[PDB]
Design an enzyme around this catalytic site. Structure first.
Site, PDB file in Angstrom:
ATOM      1  CB  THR A 154      -0.941   0.008   1.260  1.00 24.64           C
ATOM      2  OG1 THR A 154      -1.574  -1.217   1.134  1.00 24.64           O
ATOM      3  CG2 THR A 154      -1.983   1.033   1.048  1.00 24.64           C
ATOM      4  CG  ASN A 175       2.259  -1.923   3.671  1.00 26.23           C
ATOM      5  OD1 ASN A 175       2.461  -1.082   3.133  1.00 26.23           O
ATOM      6  ND2 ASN A 175       1.481  -3.038   3.626  1.00 26.23           N
TER       7      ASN A 175
HETATM    8  C1  LIG Z   1       0.203   6.765   1.519  1.00 33.51           C
HETATM    9  N1  LIG Z   1      -1.183   7.001   2.068  1.00 33.51           N
HETATM   10  C2  LIG Z   1      -1.911   7.572   1.505  1.00 33.51           C
HETATM   11  N2  LIG Z   1      -1.803   7.984   0.075  1.00 33.51           N
HETATM   12  C3  LIG Z   1      -3.029   8.355  -0.458  1.00 33.51           C
HETATM   13  C4  LIG Z   1      -3.117   8.973  -1.686  1.00 33.51           C
HETATM   14  C5  LIG Z   1      -1.861   9.171  -2.371  1.00 33.51           C
HETATM   15  C6  LIG Z   1      -1.914   9.703  -3.649  1.00 33.51           C
HETATM   16  C7  LIG Z   1      -3.208   9.577  -4.424  1.00 33.51           C
HETATM   17  F1  LIG Z   1      -3.218  10.138  -5.569  1.00 33.51           F
HETATM   18  C8  LIG Z   1      -4.339   9.179  -3.772  1.00 33.51           C
HETATM   19  C9  LIG Z   1      -4.170   8.931  -2.671  1.00 33.51           C
HETATM   20  C10 LIG Z   1      -3.915   8.572   0.736  1.00 33.51           C
HETATM   21  S1  LIG Z   1      -3.525   8.056   2.158  1.00 33.51           S
HETATM   22  C11 LIG Z   1      -1.245   6.919   3.633  1.00 33.51           C
HETATM   23  C12 LIG Z   1      -1.873   6.268   4.160  1.00 33.51           C
HETATM   24  C13 LIG Z   1      -2.869   4.909   3.790  1.00 33.51           C
HETATM   25  C14 LIG Z   1      -4.063   4.433   4.740  1.00 33.51           C
HETATM   26  C15 LIG Z   1      -3.483   3.475   5.629  1.00 33.51           C
HETATM   27  O1  LIG Z   1      -3.740   3.151   6.675  1.00 33.51           O
HETATM   28  N3  LIG Z   1      -3.006   2.381   4.752  1.00 33.51           N
HETATM   29  C16 LIG Z   1      -3.218   0.971   4.896  1.00 33.51           C
HETATM   30  C17 LIG Z   1      -4.705   0.429   5.421  1.00 33.51           C
HETATM   31  C18 LIG Z   1      -4.826  -0.822   5.275  1.00 33.51           C
HETATM   32  C19 LIG Z   1      -3.921  -1.753   4.596  1.00 33.51           C
HETATM   33  N4  LIG Z   1      -3.906  -3.002   4.467  1.00 33.51           N
HETATM   34  C20 LIG Z   1      -2.751  -3.317   4.010  1.00 33.51           C
HETATM   35  O2  LIG Z   1      -2.130  -4.472   3.547  1.00 33.51           O
HETATM   36  O3  LIG Z   1      -1.834  -2.371   3.866  1.00 33.51           O
HETATM   37  C21 LIG Z   1      -2.794  -1.143   4.168  1.00 33.51           C
HETATM   38  C22 LIG Z   1      -2.327  -0.008   4.430  1.00 33.51           C
HETATM   39  N5  LIG Z   1      -2.009   6.336   5.568  1.00 33.51           N
HETATM   40  C23 LIG Z   1      -0.927   7.285   5.625  1.00 33.51           C
HETATM   41  C24 LIG Z   1      -0.581   8.072   6.940  1.00 33.51           C
HETATM   42  C25 LIG Z   1       0.309   9.094   6.597  1.00 33.51           C
HETATM   43  C26 LIG Z   1       0.777   9.541   5.425  1.00 33.51           C
HETATM   44  C27 LIG Z   1       1.810  10.456   5.146  1.00 33.51           C
HETATM   45  C28 LIG Z   1       1.527  11.816   6.015  1.00 33.51           C
HETATM   46  C29 LIG Z   1       2.635  12.629   5.685  1.00 33.51           C
HETATM   47  N6  LIG Z   1       2.695  13.134   4.330  1.00 33.51           N
HETATM   48  S2  LIG Z   1       3.532  14.512   3.940  1.00 33.51           S
HETATM   49  C30 LIG Z   1       4.906  14.173   4.589  1.00 33.51           C
HETATM   50  O4  LIG Z   1       3.748  14.507   2.395  1.00 33.51           O
HETATM   51  O5  LIG Z   1       2.775  15.478   4.716  1.00 33.51           O
HETATM   52  C31 LIG Z   1       2.930  11.984   3.374  1.00 33.51           C
HETATM   53  C32 LIG Z   1       1.899  10.744   3.743  1.00 33.51           C
HETATM   54  N7  LIG Z   1       0.297   8.892   4.202  1.00 33.51           N
HETATM   55  N8  LIG Z   1      -0.720   7.671   4.598  1.00 33.51           N
HETATM   56 ZN   LIG Z   2      -2.925  -1.874   0.168  1.00 28.48          ZN
HETATM   57 ZN   LIG Z   3      -3.478  -5.554   2.099  1.00 30.85          ZN
END
Ligand SMILES: CN(c1nc(-c2ccc(F)cc2)cs1)c1c(CCC(=O)Nc2ccc3[nH]c(=O)oc3c2)nc2ccc(C3CCN(S(C)(=O)=O)CC3)nn12
Ligand SMILES: [Zn+2]
Ligand SMILES: [Zn+2]
Ligand SMILES: *[C@@H]1O[C@H](CO)[C@@H](O[C@@H]2O[C@H](CO)[C@@H](O[C@@H]3O[C@H](CO[C@H]4O[C@H](CO)[C@@H](O)[C@H](O)[C@@H]4O)[C@@H](O)[C@H](O[C@H]4O[C@H](CO)[C@@H](O)[C@H](O)[C@@H]4O)[C@@H]3O)[C@H](O)[C@H]2NC(C)=O)[C@H](O)[C@H]1NC(C)=O
Ligand SMILES: [Ca+2]
EC number: 3.1.4.39
Length: 778
Positions: A154, A175
């Site tokens: 992710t 991750n």
């Molecule tokens: C990386 N990321 C996200 N990227 C987007 C996104 C990016 C580009 C797009 F074009 C569209 C959407 C939305 S959120 C993320 C997430 C994802 C949420 C999560 O909890 N992940 C997750 C959930 C369930 C599962 N199951 C599995 O197997 O894997 C999983 C993953 N939690 C976060 C939290 C923080 C951040 C950071 C915050 C700081 N900023 S910053 C420095 O640029 O201000 C970067 C992103 N991303 N961060």
């Molecule tokens: Zn994922």
């Molecule tokens: Zn997954």
């Protein structure tokens, strides 16, 4: 210290004043009445007939009062139930030639609907299951599938999709990871993933902000339900000009979790895919209510796919390694191994190598991984790496879950989706599959941003859009070639190399039959010579003492010839090139481990006379005997097979130098291995670009229409430990090894510095599309 009229406020509060934003839950720093006022869940998410024209009750989740639209906090079906409108989905396809926005809107806004673990194959479930998403797809622009980045998790893929960068560049390589400089680890659980030090490059929301284009928050606390996330985007869109953002993002945790428990091919997927469609239908209904359904560009994209993975299928490193407690492992669908006591890497990788017949993983040194997976150039990426087979799992020591992801990024199950619906996007259009590294530029173009430096070929995806403010330009050549005739004499060479009279080594039937798509441009300062022959043309580098490239064409009916007993050690001197800028066999005698092979095959010469050109010193390169097994098979057998299947092929083979595994061309100092007692550099890989006519009814050398490319970057290994059945005939392993190290022409360009397809009857945007293609043999 309240969230009354602050729920999901864009501007940040900061401590010790309590917050009401999307991430306030993730620091446990929301005001006392956050959950009461902002996570309000009363009276469902849909208007009902009786609710129509209600007096605003602030306890309800959404509103059905007439003042609701002026706050953008209606239920999405407000105008459908109350007013005489219809659901978005229950409307015909009407093309959006121009953006049709309300007053104040200066540009068409971009919403990015992210769907976690949305496998490409889920799109086959169709209208009956996913009617809303289906409309977006078949009405707007869609690809069969979008290819993720390795390791198809992710955080790597969602940030790659944010930055346009390979995971290795932006730094989010999994991750979970460890950083030896920070001396800390990153985890999908915790507050450590919020520290900015982890996140490199420049994401879309920072690019936009730097260029004065406001951005909605891409991040959503898990506590915030999907219906609320939509409503918050729709409230933000309702704001005044100076407040309203231009770029948004929704994030669904689904259908990932569901896939992890019921597998990709479970019939339990239908319900979690129906709720995803609901969420989309809500957005699109909600947009229509604001007259934004013909104004907003909507991107529907996933991070990765899902594969069938049970517990019964798990390899344990305790059954391969004896010193298991010495090592730390990042387990699962991939492996990364590391020493605990801040043990010998050589031993570990050896012990993990072809030990059992049904072994469902393969060890690798990060640099020896397939270059198409740009997964090495970062201190977070461990030296020892495990590529685990699909459907399989790796642990350190020894059924709840039935699905997982994270495998090699060309795996069919790991493929995800892309759909584009908006004014800027093509109407009722279908495009070839592309990599997620590309979309940053498109999203930048959609918002009128100048992209930050990234790993997307900016022209690659112009065909997605109806209009673009970026016309790509084919790069200027830096180094012009020398075209030397016969200058030196046969007797003037003493290279320790044993073995007609005319206007020899001249043009005609050479640059037209063997350069079918123009001469490659160099794009860096180096002296090199063009060399003409009957069967091949080459770009002989005077610095590396070998070709940068060797272009040649084999017809469908072209026949194969055997190298005789005489002319086995034959290495002829090239009279066009000086002794000073040439190789010698004496070095290869000093070098016991190293041998040599030829870029142009003497196996595929036209005449027995022309076969002598194939034995020129200018056509010779350093090769381990081990690799000569691989290379000889390719040249003697496969090139002819490809030529037969593809109605001729043009081949551009050559050496690559990448001793710092950065995926880029090596400078002189960066070279590490030379041949004993010489400055003949040892290549790390050997590439070939095998082009032919996509219209196979036409020969490769008489192709009017689009091209069809298949390429690879073979690692120049002193062994075939990688290939487990390398003890068998090459007919059993070699081709599989090649298919594992397939490549985009673009990947070879990065490494060589060269630039291909300079002369075609084809648009440059199409050529960029061809150069970003990856042949997957799937
Ligand atoms: C990386 N990321 C996200 N990227 C987007 C996104 C990016 C580009 C797009 F074009 C569209 C959407 C939305 S959120 C993320 C997430 C994802 C949420 C999560 O909890 N992940 C997750 C959930 C369930 C599962 N199951 C599995 O197997 O894997 C999983 C993953 N939690 C976060 C939290 C923080 C951040 C950071 C915050 C700081 N900023 S910053 C420095 O640029 O201000 C970067 C992103 N991303 N961060
Ligand atoms: Zn994922
Ligand atoms: Zn997954
Ligand atoms: C995928 O795309 C990324 C982004 O373009 C590539 O990564 C970059 O690679 C280049 C080339 O190696 C790096 O260039 C160097 O940048 C230095 C400045 O660094 C700062 O600024 C960058 C950009 O904001 C930050 O990322 C970084 O943290 C620093 O804060 C320059 O000082 C270097 O100067 C060079 O000048 C000339 C050439 O112009 C020569 O004398 C030398 O080459 C000299 O080094 C240099 O330009 C760049 O830093 C990398 N990062 C970024 C984000 O730009 C990947 O290589 C690419 N991957 C592929 C396609 O394989
Ligand atoms: Ca390099």
């Amino acid at each position: 210290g309240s969230c009354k009229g602050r729920c999901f406020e864009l501007q940040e509060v900061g401590p010790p004043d309590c917050r009401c934003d999307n991430l306030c839950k993730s620091y446990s720093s929301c005001c006392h009445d956050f959950d009461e006022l902002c996570l309000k869940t009363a009276r469902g998410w849909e208007c009902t007939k009786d609710r129509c024209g209600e007096v605003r009750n602030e306890e309800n989740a959404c509103h059905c009062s007439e003042d609701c639209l002026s706050r953008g906090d209606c239920c999405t079906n407000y105008q459908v139930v109350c007013k005489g409108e219809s659901h978005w989905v229950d409307d015909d396809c009407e093309e959006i030639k121009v953006p049709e926005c309300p007053a104040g809107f200066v540009r068409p806004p971009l919403i990015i609907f992210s769907v976690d673990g949305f496998r490409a194959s889920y799109m086959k479930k169709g209208s009956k299951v996913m009617p809303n998403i289906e409309k977006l797809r078949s009405c707007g622009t869609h690809a069969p599938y979008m290819r993720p980045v390795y390791p198809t998790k992710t955080f790597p893929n969602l940030y790659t999709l944010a930055t346009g960068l390979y995971p290795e560049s932006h730094g989010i390589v999994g991750n979970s990871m460890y950083d030896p400089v920070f001396d800390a680890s990153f985890h999908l659980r915790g507050r450590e993933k919020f520290n900015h030090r982890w996140w490199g490059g420049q994401p879309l929301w920072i690019t936009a902000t730097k260029q004065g284009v406001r951005a909605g928050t891409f991040f959503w606390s898990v506590s915030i339900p999907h219906e609320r996330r939509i409503l918050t985007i729709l409230q933000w869109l309702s704001l005044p000009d100076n407040e309203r953002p231009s770029v948004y993002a929704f994030y669904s945790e689904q259908p990932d979790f569901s896939g992890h428990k019921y597998g990709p091919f479970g019939p339990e997927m239908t319900n979690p895919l129906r709720e995803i469609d609901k969420t989309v239908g809500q957005l699109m209904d909600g947009l229509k209510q604001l007259r934004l359904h013909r104004c907003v560009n909507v991107i529907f994209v996933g991070d990765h796919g899902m594969e069938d993975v049970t517990c019964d299928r798990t390899e344990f490193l305790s059954n391969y390694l004896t010193n298991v407690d010495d090592i730390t492992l990042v387990p699962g669908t991939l492996g990364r191994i590391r020493a605990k006591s801040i043990y010998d890497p050589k031993t570990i990788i050896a012990a993990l190598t072809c030990k059992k017949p049904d072994q469902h993983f393969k060890p690798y040194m990060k640099q020896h991984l397939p270059k198409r997976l740009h997964y090495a150039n970062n201190r977070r990426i461990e030296d020892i790496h495990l590529l685990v087979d699909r459907r399989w799992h790796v642990a350190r020591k020894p059924c709840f879950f039935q699905g997982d992801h994270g495998f090699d990024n060309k795996v069919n199950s790991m493929q995800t989706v892309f759909v584009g619906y908006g004014p800027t996007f093509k109407y009722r259009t279908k495009v070839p599959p592309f990599e997620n590294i590309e979309l940053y530029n498109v999203m930048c173009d959609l918002l009128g941003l100048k992209p930050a430096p990234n790993n997307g070929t900016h022209g690659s995806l112009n065909h997605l859009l109806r209009t673009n403010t970026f016309r790509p330009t084919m790069p200027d050549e830096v180094s012009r070639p020398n075209y030397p005739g016969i200058m030196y004499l046969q007797s003037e060479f003493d290279l320790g190399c044993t073995c007609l009279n005319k206007r020899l080594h001249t043009k005609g039937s050479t640059k037209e039959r063997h350069l079918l798509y123009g001469r490659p441009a160099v794009l860096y300062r180096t002296s090199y010579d063009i060399l003409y022959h009957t069967d091949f043309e080459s770009g002989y580098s005077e610095i590396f003492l070998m070709p940068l490239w060797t272009s040649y064409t084999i017809s469908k009916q072209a026949e194969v010839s055997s190298i005789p007993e005489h002319l086995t050690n034959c290495v002829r001197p090239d009279v066009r090139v000086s002794p000073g800028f040439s190789q010698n066999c004496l070095a290869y005698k000093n070098d016991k481990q190293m041998s040599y092979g030829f870029l142009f095959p003497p196996y595929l010469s036209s005449s027995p006379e022309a076969k002598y050109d194939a034995f020129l010193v200018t056509n010779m390169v350093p090769m381990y005997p081990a690799f000569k097994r691989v290379w000889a098979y390719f040249q003697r057998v496969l090139v002819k097979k490809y030529a037969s299947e593809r109605n001729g092929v043009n081949v551009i083979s050559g050496p690559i130098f990448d001793y710092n595994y950065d995926g880029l061309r090596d400078t002189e100092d960066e070279i590490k291995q030379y041949v004993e007692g010489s400055s003949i550099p040892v290549p790390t890989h050997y590439y070939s670009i095998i082009t032919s006519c996509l219209d196979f009814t036409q020969p490769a050398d008489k192709c009017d229409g689009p091209l069809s490319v298949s390429s690879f970057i073979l690692p120049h290994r002193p062994d075939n430990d990688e290939s487990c059945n390398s003890s068998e005939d090459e007919s059993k392993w070699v081709e599989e090894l090649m298919k594992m190290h397939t490549a985009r022409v673009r990947d070879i360009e990065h490494l060589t510095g060269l630039d291909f397809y300079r002369k075609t009857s084809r648009s440059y945007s199409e050529i960029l599309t061809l150069k970003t293609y990856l042949h997957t043999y799937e």
